[PDB]
Amino acid sequence: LPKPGTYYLPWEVSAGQVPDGSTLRTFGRLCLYDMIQSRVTLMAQHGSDQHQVLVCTKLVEPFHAQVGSLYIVLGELQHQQDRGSVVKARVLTCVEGMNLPLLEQAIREQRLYKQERGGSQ
Amino acid sequence: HQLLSPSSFSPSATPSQKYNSRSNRGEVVTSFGLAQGVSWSGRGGAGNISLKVLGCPEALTGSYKSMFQKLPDIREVLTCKIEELGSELKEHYKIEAFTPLLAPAQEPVTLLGQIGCDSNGKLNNKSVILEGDREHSSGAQIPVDLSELKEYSLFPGQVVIMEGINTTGRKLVATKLYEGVPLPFYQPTEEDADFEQSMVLVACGPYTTSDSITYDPLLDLIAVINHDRPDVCILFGPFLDAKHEQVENCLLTSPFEDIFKQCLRTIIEGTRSSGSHLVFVPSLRDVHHEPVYPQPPFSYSDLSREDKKQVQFVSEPCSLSINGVIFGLTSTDLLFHLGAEEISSSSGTSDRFSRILKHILTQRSYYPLYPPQEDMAIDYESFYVYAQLPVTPDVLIIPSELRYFVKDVLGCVCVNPGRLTKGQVGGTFARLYLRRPAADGAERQSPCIAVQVVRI
Amino acid sequence: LSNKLIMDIRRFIKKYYDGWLICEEPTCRNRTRHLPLQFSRTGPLCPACMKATLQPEYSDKSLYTQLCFYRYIFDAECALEKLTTDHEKDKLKKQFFTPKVLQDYRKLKNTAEQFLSRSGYSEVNLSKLFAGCAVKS
């Protein structure tokens, strides 16, 4: 059995605020599909800032690509020497039309409740 | 000696004397500028004429495949245009950031989106919805409340930046409304100022009466242009309207292509005496030409060597630049559509046509209306790649079915000569002046100085 | 006949570029021309039912089939080839079919084929298909 997948907004993982080898699930919008090297570069906006996450895909071929669309990625993170941070994909589904603010508020509320229950112990 | 032979094509036509009964021939219905005490004539193309087709970096030259369309292409084109214009407006007006459409916040925020009407019917102030963009809200749709709005003038497919309050994320109340920004004027170079003057005439179809193919207004216009001998002669389409009963019931004895070839031969032979430059712009009502806007120019392989230097065909729309003057050319009726499909409530009386003209100048689109008019076909890919305004044109030519008028907005001259034939009586045609002024002054001045519209 | 055929073809293409769409929900059956800007895993979303998608009212396949049908009735050569009985084919060709009739049939077929040349449905772009490979162009 594997470890569970905790949610993480793109900008935190972009800054490397998670330990190496952790399992995380995040979101973003695809920007490029490097065919030969099996690499995916998705992007997510934050005000005037744009953040990039590198996704290895060696475990989900065959895989259709939808340029300029949202995605959900779940897997493990490995801190490479030069490439930086890349997530090893285990499941990679596509969702469209789902509004970000509801999701962001949802994880914020869940984190708040978890911390509140953590105040008794 | 009618060079064209309507009797051969249809020997069952009786001439109509309503056009022949005209009594106000040669009357100038309206004018603008210094048109008093100035002779209205030309050199018949005996001077120096420069032609420059502008617009897309690769101006339309040939044909392209049409009957193949996919929805993601349409979405990509729409979102690219929306995001480009939004970014330009943000750079112009110093907007710090854009709030997502569905974000609920009590503090007023600024949202970017397209103007559309939810109702299937005509647009109205109680049926306005704002549609977002892919890069920020992925096709959001929120109703707009203009009750607090003071003045408004909107049409479907209008790119606006609007600031309001979104409490629950579903209902938005308008609190502000911005305005479009025109493209910078083209700057004439050293060579442009050298040209002193030229004569350009504007004409538009249909060149038939309600039920007569005798082409009497066509012959009279041919005689007028031959006598006047303008430097540049420009005639708009259609050269053969499909609304005629003879072509409706298929009563013609000659092929349509042959009929148009004979008409073009007639025009060339008639204009040979004048020896003036001929420019032909196709229209969406043409029969022999495929009706998808934009469309390739007409094809003619029988042009003589001598006449090749003065006869040309350009795509619709075209941006023809002569002697450093930009001409806005379109064979489509923007004004009628826009007037039929626009709603406004202004605190003061103002010209609706001027508002439409400033809107289309600001929207940076020849046909910014979306969805278009149910009487024509638009290829969205070709429209985006080929039908974008290069720069702000000094002159704009808009044939229309509405009332003839001449108006100037933001340094751009716009002419509405109207149809040359109205029912069974002649319409109006206009004549233009192009005098290059001194570019010494800081303020750019329109080289066009006078215009007169002569009734036919 | 040719002047009626050109009008008919213009009518078909005008109908095709109407852009009408219909909702896929059996209880909605919405009809609209405002194509939205939010897609899903399959395509545009119906702005009325918020659950189903939108499909074209008159797809390219029907248009191409109609044009092929128009070209079908003006190919006497294919009909002659399809004639299994050689003797009857020769008898029909000799008894009535002068070469001038064949020339007229070709003239009629020319106008129908004229619009077929610019049709993009029968044209495949090879650049898109193999664009993925980039090792050796």
PDB file of all heavy atoms in Angstrom, chain B residues 120-150:
ATOM      1  N   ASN B 120     -32.071  34.235 -26.752  1.00  0.00           N
ATOM      2  CA  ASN B 120     -31.931  33.949 -28.173  1.00  0.00           C
ATOM      3  C   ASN B 120     -32.372  35.118 -29.043  1.00  0.00           C
ATOM      4  O   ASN B 120     -31.932  35.220 -30.193  1.00  0.00           O
ATOM      5  CB  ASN B 120     -32.731  32.699 -28.540  1.00  0.00           C
ATOM      6  CG  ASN B 120     -32.257  31.465 -27.799  1.00  0.00           C
ATOM      7  OD1 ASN B 120     -31.055  31.234 -27.661  1.00  0.00           O
ATOM      8  ND2 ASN B 120     -33.200  30.663 -27.319  1.00  0.00           N
ATOM      9  N   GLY B 121     -33.224  35.996 -28.523  1.00  0.00           N
ATOM     10  CA  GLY B 121     -33.715  37.132 -29.274  1.00  0.00           C
ATOM     11  C   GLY B 121     -32.726  38.279 -29.291  1.00  0.00           C
ATOM     12  O   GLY B 121     -31.546  38.130 -28.968  1.00  0.00           O
ATOM     13  N   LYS B 122     -33.228  39.447 -29.684  1.00  0.00           N
ATOM     14  CA  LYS B 122     -32.391  40.635 -29.768  1.00  0.00           C
ATOM     15  C   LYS B 122     -31.896  41.044 -28.386  1.00  0.00           C
ATOM     16  O   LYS B 122     -32.542  40.790 -27.367  1.00  0.00           O
ATOM     17  CB  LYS B 122     -33.161  41.789 -30.409  1.00  0.00           C
ATOM     18  CG  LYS B 122     -33.187  41.751 -31.927  1.00  0.00           C
ATOM     19  CD  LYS B 122     -33.218  43.153 -32.511  1.00  0.00           C
ATOM     20  CE  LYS B 122     -33.439  43.118 -34.015  1.00  0.00           C
ATOM     21  NZ  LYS B 122     -32.710  44.214 -34.709  1.00  0.00           N
ATOM     22  N   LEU B 123     -30.730  41.683 -28.364  1.00  0.00           N
ATOM     23  CA  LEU B 123     -30.135  42.119 -27.110  1.00  0.00           C
ATOM     24  C   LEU B 123     -30.990  43.193 -26.448  1.00  0.00           C
ATOM     25  O   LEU B 123     -31.629  44.013 -27.114  1.00  0.00           O
ATOM     26  CB  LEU B 123     -28.717  42.650 -27.339  1.00  0.00           C
ATOM     27  CG  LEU B 123     -28.528  44.011 -28.017  1.00  0.00           C
ATOM     28  CD1 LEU B 123     -27.107  44.504 -27.805  1.00  0.00           C
ATOM     29  CD2 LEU B 123     -28.848  43.956 -29.504  1.00  0.00           C
ATOM     30  N   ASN B 124     -31.006  43.172 -25.118  1.00  0.00           N
ATOM     31  CA  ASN B 124     -31.722  44.168 -24.338  1.00  0.00           C
ATOM     32  C   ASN B 124     -31.020  44.334 -23.000  1.00  0.00           C
ATOM     33  O   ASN B 124     -30.257  43.468 -22.566  1.00  0.00           O
ATOM     34  CB  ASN B 124     -33.195  43.786 -24.144  1.00  0.00           C
ATOM     35  CG  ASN B 124     -33.365  42.469 -23.420  1.00  0.00           C
ATOM     36  OD1 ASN B 124     -33.257  42.401 -22.194  1.00  0.00           O
ATOM     37  ND2 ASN B 124     -33.630  41.409 -24.174  1.00  0.00           N
ATOM     38  N   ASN B 125     -31.290  45.467 -22.348  1.00  0.00           N
ATOM     39  CA  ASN B 125     -30.613  45.802 -21.100  1.00  0.00           C
ATOM     40  C   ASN B 125     -30.951  44.847 -19.962  1.00  0.00           C
ATOM     41  O   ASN B 125     -30.256  44.863 -18.940  1.00  0.00           O
ATOM     42  CB  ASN B 125     -30.953  47.238 -20.693  1.00  0.00           C
ATOM     43  CG  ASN B 125     -32.447  47.495 -20.646  1.00  0.00           C
ATOM     44  OD1 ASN B 125     -33.254  46.585 -20.832  1.00  0.00           O
ATOM     45  ND2 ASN B 125     -32.822  48.744 -20.397  1.00  0.00           N
ATOM     46  N   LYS B 126     -31.988  44.026 -20.106  1.00  0.00           N
ATOM     47  CA  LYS B 126     -32.359  43.052 -19.091  1.00  0.00           C
ATOM     48  C   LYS B 126     -31.884  41.644 -19.426  1.00  0.00           C
ATOM     49  O   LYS B 126     -32.252  40.694 -18.727  1.00  0.00           O
ATOM     50  CB  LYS B 126     -33.877  43.056 -18.889  1.00  0.00           C
ATOM     51  CG  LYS B 126     -34.473  44.388 -18.431  1.00  0.00           C
ATOM     52  CD  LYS B 126     -34.124  44.732 -16.983  1.00  0.00           C
ATOM     53  CE  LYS B 126     -32.899  45.633 -16.874  1.00  0.00           C
ATOM     54  NZ  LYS B 126     -32.640  46.044 -15.469  1.00  0.00           N
ATOM     55  N   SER B 127     -31.079  41.486 -20.474  1.00  0.00           N
ATOM     56  CA  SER B 127     -30.616  40.172 -20.915  1.00  0.00           C
ATOM     57  C   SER B 127     -29.131  40.223 -21.256  1.00  0.00           C
ATOM     58  O   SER B 127     -28.683  39.697 -22.276  1.00  0.00           O
ATOM     59  CB  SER B 127     -31.435  39.682 -22.108  1.00  0.00           C
ATOM     60  OG  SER B 127     -31.104  40.403 -23.281  1.00  0.00           O
ATOM     61  N   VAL B 128     -28.343  40.864 -20.398  1.00  0.00           N
ATOM     62  CA  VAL B 128     -26.905  41.003 -20.603  1.00  0.00           C
ATOM     63  C   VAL B 128     -26.177  40.034 -19.679  1.00  0.00           C
ATOM     64  O   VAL B 128     -26.491  39.942 -18.485  1.00  0.00           O
ATOM     65  CB  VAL B 128     -26.444  42.453 -20.373  1.00  0.00           C
ATOM     66  CG1 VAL B 128     -26.854  42.946 -18.993  1.00  0.00           C
ATOM     67  CG2 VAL B 128     -24.938  42.567 -20.559  1.00  0.00           C
ATOM     68  N   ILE B 129     -25.224  39.293 -20.237  1.00  0.00           N
ATOM     69  CA  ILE B 129     -24.393  38.363 -19.483  1.00  0.00           C
ATOM     70  C   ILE B 129     -22.942  38.567 -19.895  1.00  0.00           C
ATOM     71  O   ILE B 129     -22.650  38.832 -21.066  1.00  0.00           O
ATOM     72  CB  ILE B 129     -24.817  36.895 -19.698  1.00  0.00           C
ATOM     73  CG1 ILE B 129     -24.786  36.538 -21.185  1.00  0.00           C
ATOM     74  CG2 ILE B 129     -26.195  36.641 -19.107  1.00  0.00           C
ATOM     75  CD1 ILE B 129     -24.808  35.052 -21.453  1.00  0.00           C
ATOM     76  N   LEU B 130     -22.036  38.453 -18.930  1.00  0.00           N
ATOM     77  CA  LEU B 130     -20.610  38.599 -19.174  1.00  0.00           C
ATOM     78  C   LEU B 130     -19.972  37.221 -19.288  1.00  0.00           C
ATOM     79  O   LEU B 130     -20.170  36.366 -18.418  1.00  0.00           O
ATOM     80  CB  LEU B 130     -19.944  39.400 -18.055  1.00  0.00           C
ATOM     81  CG  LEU B 130     -18.443  39.647 -18.205  1.00  0.00           C
ATOM     82  CD1 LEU B 130     -18.170  40.519 -19.417  1.00  0.00           C
ATOM     83  CD2 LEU B 130     -17.878  40.282 -16.946  1.00  0.00           C
ATOM     84  N   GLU B 131     -19.212  37.010 -20.359  1.00  0.00           N
ATOM     85  CA  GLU B 131     -18.542  35.743 -20.617  1.00  0.00           C
ATOM     86  C   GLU B 131     -17.038  35.934 -20.487  1.00  0.00           C
ATOM     87  O   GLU B 131     -16.458  36.795 -21.158  1.00  0.00           O
ATOM     88  CB  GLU B 131     -18.894  35.209 -22.005  1.00  0.00           C
ATOM     89  CG  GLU B 131     -18.405  33.795 -22.270  1.00  0.00           C
ATOM     90  CD  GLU B 131     -19.124  33.138 -23.433  1.00  0.00           C
ATOM     91  OE1 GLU B 131     -19.909  33.829 -24.114  1.00  0.00           O
ATOM     92  OE2 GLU B 131     -18.905  31.931 -23.665  1.00  0.00           O
ATOM     93  N   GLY B 132     -16.411  35.124 -19.639  1.00  0.00           N
ATOM     94  CA  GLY B 132     -15.005  35.268 -19.333  1.00  0.00           C
ATOM     95  C   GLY B 132     -14.106  34.650 -20.387  1.00  0.00           C
ATOM     96  O   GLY B 132     -14.514  34.341 -21.507  1.00  0.00           O
ATOM     97  N   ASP B 133     -12.845  34.472 -20.004  1.00  0.00           N
ATOM     98  CA  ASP B 133     -11.819  33.950 -20.891  1.00  0.00           C
ATOM     99  C   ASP B 133     -11.164  32.717 -20.279  1.00  0.00           C
ATOM    100  O   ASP B 133     -11.259  32.464 -19.074  1.00  0.00           O
ATOM    101  CB  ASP B 133     -10.757  35.013 -21.197  1.00  0.00           C
ATOM    102  CG  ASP B 133     -10.207  35.663 -19.947  1.00  0.00           C
ATOM    103  OD1 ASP B 133     -10.709  35.358 -18.846  1.00  0.00           O
ATOM    104  OD2 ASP B 133      -9.272  36.484 -20.065  1.00  0.00           O
ATOM    105  N   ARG B 134     -10.502  31.945 -21.145  1.00  0.00           N
ATOM    106  CA  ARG B 134      -9.903  30.683 -20.722  1.00  0.00           C
ATOM    107  C   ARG B 134      -8.811  30.900 -19.683  1.00  0.00           C
ATOM    108  O   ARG B 134      -8.741  30.174 -18.685  1.00  0.00           O
ATOM    109  CB  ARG B 134      -9.342  29.944 -21.936  1.00  0.00           C
ATOM    110  CG  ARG B 134      -8.336  28.859 -21.594  1.00  0.00           C
ATOM    111  CD  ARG B 134      -7.547  28.433 -22.819  1.00  0.00           C
ATOM    112  NE  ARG B 134      -6.512  29.402 -23.158  1.00  0.00           N
ATOM    113  CZ  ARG B 134      -5.606  29.230 -24.111  1.00  0.00           C
ATOM    114  NH1 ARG B 134      -5.580  28.133 -24.849  1.00  0.00           N
ATOM    115  NH2 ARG B 134      -4.706  30.184 -24.330  1.00  0.00           N
ATOM    116  N   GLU B 135      -7.956  31.900 -19.893  1.00  0.00           N
ATOM    117  CA  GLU B 135      -6.793  32.088 -19.036  1.00  0.00           C
ATOM    118  C   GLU B 135      -7.151  32.547 -17.629  1.00  0.00           C
ATOM    119  O   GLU B 135      -6.276  32.544 -16.757  1.00  0.00           O
ATOM    120  CB  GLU B 135      -5.832  33.091 -19.676  1.00  0.00           C
ATOM    121  CG  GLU B 135      -4.378  32.892 -19.283  1.00  0.00           C
ATOM    122  CD  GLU B 135      -3.448  33.863 -19.981  1.00  0.00           C
ATOM    123  OE1 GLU B 135      -3.950  34.765 -20.686  1.00  0.00           O
ATOM    124  OE2 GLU B 135      -2.217  33.726 -19.827  1.00  0.00           O
ATOM    125  N   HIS B 136      -8.392  32.934 -17.381  1.00  0.00           N
ATOM    126  CA  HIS B 136      -8.719  33.427 -16.049  1.00  0.00           C
ATOM    127  C   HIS B 136      -9.903  32.719 -15.408  1.00  0.00           C
ATOM    128  O   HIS B 136      -9.879  32.481 -14.199  1.00  0.00           O
ATOM    129  CB  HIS B 136      -8.984  34.937 -16.105  1.00  0.00           C
ATOM    130  CG  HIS B 136      -7.736  35.764 -16.093  1.00  0.00           C
ATOM    131  ND1 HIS B 136      -6.798  35.710 -17.103  1.00  0.00           N
ATOM    132  CD2 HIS B 136      -7.268  36.661 -15.193  1.00  0.00           C
ATOM    133  CE1 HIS B 136      -5.809  36.539 -16.826  1.00  0.00           C
ATOM    134  NE2 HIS B 136      -6.069  37.130 -15.673  1.00  0.00           N
ATOM    135  N   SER B 137     -10.937  32.371 -16.178  1.00  0.00           N
ATOM    136  CA  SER B 137     -12.108  31.745 -15.583  1.00  0.00           C
ATOM    137  C   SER B 137     -12.685  30.591 -16.389  1.00  0.00           C
ATOM    138  O   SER B 137     -13.702  30.028 -15.969  1.00  0.00           O
ATOM    139  CB  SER B 137     -13.204  32.794 -15.344  1.00  0.00           C
ATOM    140  OG  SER B 137     -12.822  33.697 -14.320  1.00  0.00           O
ATOM    141  N   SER B 138     -12.077  30.215 -17.515  1.00  0.00           N
ATOM    142  CA  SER B 138     -12.468  29.037 -18.289  1.00  0.00           C
ATOM    143  C   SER B 138     -13.953  29.089 -18.669  1.00  0.00           C
ATOM    144  O   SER B 138     -14.770  28.271 -18.244  1.00  0.00           O
ATOM    145  CB  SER B 138     -12.140  27.749 -17.523  1.00  0.00           C
ATOM    146  OG  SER B 138     -10.746  27.627 -17.308  1.00  0.00           O
ATOM    147  N   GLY B 139     -14.279  30.091 -19.482  1.00  0.00           N
ATOM    148  CA  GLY B 139     -15.615  30.213 -20.032  1.00  0.00           C
ATOM    149  C   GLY B 139     -16.702  30.470 -19.010  1.00  0.00           C
ATOM    150  O   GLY B 139     -17.749  29.815 -19.026  1.00  0.00           O
ATOM    151  N   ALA B 140     -16.461  31.417 -18.109  1.00  0.00           N
ATOM    152  CA  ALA B 140     -17.450  31.781 -17.110  1.00  0.00           C
ATOM    153  C   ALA B 140     -18.617  32.530 -17.748  1.00  0.00           C
ATOM    154  O   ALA B 140     -18.505  33.107 -18.832  1.00  0.00           O
ATOM    155  CB  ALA B 140     -16.815  32.641 -16.021  1.00  0.00           C
ATOM    156  N   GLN B 141     -19.758  32.506 -17.060  1.00  0.00           N
ATOM    157  CA  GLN B 141     -20.950  33.232 -17.491  1.00  0.00           C
ATOM    158  C   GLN B 141     -21.646  33.799 -16.265  1.00  0.00           C
ATOM    159  O   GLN B 141     -22.123  33.041 -15.417  1.00  0.00           O
ATOM    160  CB  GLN B 141     -21.900  32.324 -18.276  1.00  0.00           C
ATOM    161  CG  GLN B 141     -21.564  32.200 -19.751  1.00  0.00           C
ATOM    162  CD  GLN B 141     -22.627  31.450 -20.526  1.00  0.00           C
ATOM    163  OE1 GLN B 141     -23.778  31.365 -20.099  1.00  0.00           O
ATOM    164  NE2 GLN B 141     -22.246  30.898 -21.672  1.00  0.00           N
ATOM    165  N   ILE B 142     -21.704  35.124 -16.174  1.00  0.00           N
ATOM    166  CA  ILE B 142     -22.315  35.800 -15.030  1.00  0.00           C
ATOM    167  C   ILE B 142     -23.269  36.881 -15.524  1.00  0.00           C
ATOM    168  O   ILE B 142     -22.907  37.664 -16.414  1.00  0.00           O
ATOM    169  CB  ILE B 142     -21.249  36.399 -14.096  1.00  0.00           C
ATOM    170  CG1 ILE B 142     -20.384  35.302 -13.468  1.00  0.00           C
ATOM    171  CG2 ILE B 142     -21.897  37.246 -13.011  1.00  0.00           C
ATOM    172  CD1 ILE B 142     -19.141  34.954 -14.257  1.00  0.00           C
ATOM    173  N   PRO B 143     -24.488  36.956 -14.994  1.00  0.00           N
ATOM    174  CA  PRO B 143     -25.387  38.055 -15.364  1.00  0.00           C
ATOM    175  C   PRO B 143     -24.849  39.398 -14.900  1.00  0.00           C
ATOM    176  O   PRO B 143     -24.170  39.504 -13.875  1.00  0.00           O
ATOM    177  CB  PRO B 143     -26.698  37.704 -14.649  1.00  0.00           C
ATOM    178  CG  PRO B 143     -26.587  36.248 -14.315  1.00  0.00           C
ATOM    179  CD  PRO B 143     -25.133  35.998 -14.083  1.00  0.00           C
ATOM    180  N   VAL B 144     -25.169  40.435 -15.669  1.00  0.00           N
ATOM    181  CA  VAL B 144     -24.699  41.792 -15.416  1.00  0.00           C
ATOM    182  C   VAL B 144     -25.898  42.661 -15.067  1.00  0.00           C
ATOM    183  O   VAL B 144     -26.924  42.617 -15.755  1.00  0.00           O
ATOM    184  CB  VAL B 144     -23.944  42.368 -16.627  1.00  0.00           C
ATOM    185  CG1 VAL B 144     -23.279  43.686 -16.259  1.00  0.00           C
ATOM    186  CG2 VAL B 144     -22.919  41.371 -17.137  1.00  0.00           C
ATOM    187  N   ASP B 145     -25.768  43.444 -14.000  1.00  0.00           N
ATOM    188  CA  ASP B 145     -26.813  44.361 -13.555  1.00  0.00           C
ATOM    189  C   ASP B 145     -26.379  45.782 -13.896  1.00  0.00           C
ATOM    190  O   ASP B 145     -25.425  46.304 -13.307  1.00  0.00           O
ATOM    191  CB  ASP B 145     -27.071  44.206 -12.058  1.00  0.00           C
ATOM    192  CG  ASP B 145     -28.366  44.862 -11.619  1.00  0.00           C
ATOM    193  OD1 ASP B 145     -29.064  45.441 -12.477  1.00  0.00           O
ATOM    194  OD2 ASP B 145     -28.686  44.798 -10.414  1.00  0.00           O
ATOM    195  N   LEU B 146     -27.081  46.405 -14.843  1.00  0.00           N
ATOM    196  CA  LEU B 146     -26.792  47.765 -15.273  1.00  0.00           C
ATOM    197  C   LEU B 146     -27.733  48.788 -14.647  1.00  0.00           C
ATOM    198  O   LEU B 146     -27.802  49.928 -15.121  1.00  0.00           O
ATOM    199  CB  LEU B 146     -26.829  47.855 -16.802  1.00  0.00           C
ATOM    200  CG  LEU B 146     -28.089  47.427 -17.563  1.00  0.00           C
ATOM    201  CD1 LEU B 146     -29.102  48.558 -17.696  1.00  0.00           C
ATOM    202  CD2 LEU B 146     -27.707  46.893 -18.934  1.00  0.00           C
ATOM    203  N   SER B 147     -28.462  48.404 -13.597  1.00  0.00           N
ATOM    204  CA  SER B 147     -29.370  49.341 -12.943  1.00  0.00           C
ATOM    205  C   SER B 147     -28.613  50.538 -12.383  1.00  0.00           C
ATOM    206  O   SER B 147     -29.072  51.681 -12.499  1.00  0.00           O
ATOM    207  CB  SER B 147     -30.147  48.632 -11.835  1.00  0.00           C
ATOM    208  OG  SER B 147     -29.273  48.137 -10.835  1.00  0.00           O
ATOM    209  N   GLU B 148     -27.452  50.298 -11.775  1.00  0.00           N
ATOM    210  CA  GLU B 148     -26.628  51.389 -11.273  1.00  0.00           C
ATOM    211  C   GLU B 148     -25.881  52.118 -12.382  1.00  0.00           C
ATOM    212  O   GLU B 148     -25.378  53.222 -12.148  1.00  0.00           O
ATOM    213  CB  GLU B 148     -25.629  50.859 -10.241  1.00  0.00           C
ATOM    214  CG  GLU B 148     -25.266  51.859  -9.156  1.00  0.00           C
ATOM    215  CD  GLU B 148     -24.047  52.688  -9.511  1.00  0.00           C
ATOM    216  OE1 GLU B 148     -23.229  52.221 -10.331  1.00  0.00           O
ATOM    217  OE2 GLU B 148     -23.910  53.806  -8.973  1.00  0.00           O
ATOM    218  N   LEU B 149     -25.803  51.536 -13.575  1.00  0.00           N
ATOM    219  CA  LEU B 149     -25.073  52.162 -14.667  1.00  0.00           C
ATOM    220  C   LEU B 149     -25.781  53.429 -15.134  1.00  0.00           C
ATOM    221  O   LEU B 149     -27.010  53.473 -15.239  1.00  0.00           O
ATOM    222  CB  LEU B 149     -24.919  51.187 -15.833  1.00  0.00           C
ATOM    223  CG  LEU B 149     -23.678  50.291 -15.804  1.00  0.00           C
ATOM    224  CD1 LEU B 149     -23.524  49.542 -17.119  1.00  0.00           C
ATOM    225  CD2 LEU B 149     -22.430  51.106 -15.495  1.00  0.00           C
ATOM    226  N   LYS B 150     -24.991  54.465 -15.416  1.00  0.00           N
ATOM    227  CA  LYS B 150     -25.547  55.740 -15.858  1.00  0.00           C
ATOM    228  C   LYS B 150     -25.864  55.713 -17.349  1.00  0.00           C
ATOM    229  O   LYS B 150     -27.015  55.902 -17.756  1.00  0.00           O
ATOM    230  CB  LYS B 150     -24.575  56.879 -15.534  1.00  0.00           C
ATOM    231  CG  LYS B 150     -24.714  57.455 -14.130  1.00  0.00           C
ATOM    232  CD  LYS B 150     -24.270  56.463 -13.065  1.00  0.00           C
ATOM    233  CE  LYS B 150     -22.821  56.050 -13.261  1.00  0.00           C
ATOM    234  NZ  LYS B 150     -22.389  55.043 -12.252  1.00  0.00           N
TER     235      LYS B 150
END
